[PDB]
Ligand binder design. Structure first.
Ligand SMILES: *[C@@H]1O[C@H](CO)[C@@H](O[C@@H]2O[C@H](CO)[C@@H](O)[C@H](O)[C@H]2NC(C)=O)[C@H](O)[C@H]1NC(C)=O
Ligand SMILES: *[C@@H]1O[C@H](CO)[C@@H](O)[C@H](O)[C@H]1NC(C)=O
Ligand SMILES: *[C@@H]1O[C@H](CO)[C@@H](O)[C@H](O)[C@H]1NC(C)=O
Ligand SMILES: *[C@@H]1O[C@H](CO)[C@@H](O)[C@H](O)[C@H]1NC(C)=O
Ligand SMILES: *[C@@H]1O[C@H](CO)[C@@H](O)[C@H](O)[C@H]1NC(C)=O
Ligand SMILES: *[C@H]1O[C@H](CO)[C@@H](O)[C@H](O)[C@H]1NC(C)=O
Ligand SMILES: [Ca+2]
Lengths: 271, 104, 104
């Protein structure tokens, strides 16, 4: 939750002059409330867009368009405060629209968009756009929330975004398990561009059962910059046992972003 | 007793949040409690989905319990009784999620 | 700016977390009290995951499971040499989450 650029932004439109002023989610209307308030927004809607920084990197940006309700209280509206709330971490991120010029008519629809909130990949957020001034104590709400859900790093266009490139779904390790000698297996897989260790976890189960006869872990030291992207090969001696035919080998990476929680890859052999 | 409307964060996360709500052995769901009289309006609260944690099979292990982890935070609550508007601080216990524990 | 009151709403509030949660969890953690005189609350506690994996009832660390923390953005008032509140990112505790696996 942050706005990709500190660049200035535009909320003006044919008929309206306003500017966007960073705002804590506190407003001079919440305290020192004005007498006559405006009506809620209507048609709040949130889509998924992706924007570049000035540097190469690109993030998933939340695109908030809402329109202005068509009634008399428009006269008295003087801005709208947006609030993005990440549910996990109780993090709120506000900006605020401010109209230099009031508007007295509803001749055609007053639509607003704002897509400069950067968003995390698997995250659910609750965007909510209050109208300004804010309701007097014990008055009508005049805002409009809408839950928003960002798809995991498997989204066709998502996975190609910076936060998913780091700890990236772009890293696939061609995983090769060769039966080899009896009581011996040789696993190969290609590795990432980060000098952080890995871990293979070979567990073998009785066929048709979820108990494990044999389980062996193998630490792999942090790759040197020269070794990046070059398959690594580990030969492990399996348990000399009958019925211990079914083998699951999974690989866990520890990339800086997501360290320890990274997704793992399980290949399984059956006899 | 004056509180500066100004606020600043040196605490920008710069890390990755994770969708562990449902991947937990003690899963929970979130609820956005909303009060127009306090700042911030929205405070997200979580409640445990089950009474016991959840095994690897998917079945609920009754023997170990799903329990709430709580955090102390401040919200400013504005009271308006009368013509006067006046707000004081407030310690509120947001439930952040749930963890799995061995009963005693 | 903004008018404060005696405040301290429901200051006398007791956390309902099952005592010793940090220890009895399948994904236990350490609590770090960092102390500041001019932040309120003055005492800052932050939790640290103890084991990369999660602990079975037997007490031995399972690696097929990740132990991952829960963070909250929270509100505190920073005192001045003038009272202003500002956001602090606290890690509250840990939960046991089943890792996400990709099969081929
Ligand atoms: C609280 O947290 C840390 C994290 O487990 C623990 O401090 C570590 O102690 C272990 C055991 O020797 C070591 O692996 C680490 O080197 C220590 N900390 C670090 C990251 O340097 C500690 O066990 C916990 N509390 C205490 C002091 O017992
Ligand atoms: C904004 O509004 C008026 C009328 O829309 C426009 O003519 C003017 O250029 C703007 N005000 C300024 C000077 O920023
Ligand atoms: C927000 O506004 C303050 C005051 O206008 C300004 O000092 C600050 O740079 C802004 N925050 C950012 C960096 O977007
Ligand atoms: C409403 O606003 C008018 C003009 O500012 C003011 O005279 C009046 O006292 C206000 N009413 C209230 C809430 O006291
Ligand atoms: C690793 O290479 C570059 C440079 O470190 C990095 O930006 C990128 O995310 C990784 N490569 C791929 C294929 O994503
Ligand atoms: C692993 O050995 C494989 C197959 O024998 C070979 O293709 C590859 O060069 C080896 N990887 C490295 C760099 O050790
Ligand atoms: Ca989620």
């Amino acid at each position: 939750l942050r706005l990709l650029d500190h660049r200035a932004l535009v909320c003006s439109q044919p008929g309206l002059n306003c500017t966007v002023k960073n705002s804590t989610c506190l407003d001079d209307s919440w305290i020192h409330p004005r007498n006559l308030t405006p009506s809620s927004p209507k048609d709040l809607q949130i889509q998924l867009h992706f924007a570049h920084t000035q540097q190469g990197d690109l993030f998933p940006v939340a695109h908030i368009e809402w329109t202005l309700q068509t009634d008399a209280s428009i006269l008295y509206l003087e801005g709208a405060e947006l609030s993005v709330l990440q549910l996990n971490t109780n993090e709120r991120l506000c900006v605020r629209f401010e109209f230099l010029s009031k508007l007295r008519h509803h001749h055609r629809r007053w639509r607003f968009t704002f897509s400069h909130f950067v968003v995390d990949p698997d995250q659910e957020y609750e965007v909510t756009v209050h109208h300004l001034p804010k309701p007097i104590p014990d008055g009508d709400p005049n805002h409009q929330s809408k839950n928003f859900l960002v798809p995991d790093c498997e989204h066709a266009r998502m996975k190609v975004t910076t936060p998913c490139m780091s700890s990236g779904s772009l890293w696939d390790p061609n995983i090769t398990v060769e039966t080899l000698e009896a009581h011996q297996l040789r696993v190969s897989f290609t590795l990432w561009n980060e000098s952080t260790h890995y871990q293979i976890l070979l567990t073998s189960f009785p066929h048709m059962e979820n108990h494990s006869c044999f389980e062996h872990m193998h630490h792999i030291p942090a790759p040197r910059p020269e070794e990046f992207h070059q398959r690594s090969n580990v030969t492990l001696t399996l348990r000399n046992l009958k019925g211990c035919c079914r083998h699951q080998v999974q690989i866990q990476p520890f990339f800086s972003s997501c360290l320890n929680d990274c997704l793992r890859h399980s290949a399984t052999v059956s006899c | 007793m004056k509180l500066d409307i100004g606020i600043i964060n040196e605490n920008q996360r710069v890390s990755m949040s994770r969708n562990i709500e449902s991947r937990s052995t003690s899963p929970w769901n979130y609820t956005v409690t909303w009060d127009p009289n306090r700042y911030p309006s929205e405070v997200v609260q979580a409640q445990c989905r089950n009474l016991g944690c959840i095994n690897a099979q998917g079945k609920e292990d009754i023997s170990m319990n799903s329990v709430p982890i709580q955090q102390e935070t401040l919200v400013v609550r504005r009271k308006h009784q009368g013509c006067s508007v006046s707000f004081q601080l407030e310690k509120v216990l947001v439930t952040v999620g749930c963890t799995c524990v061995t009963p005693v």
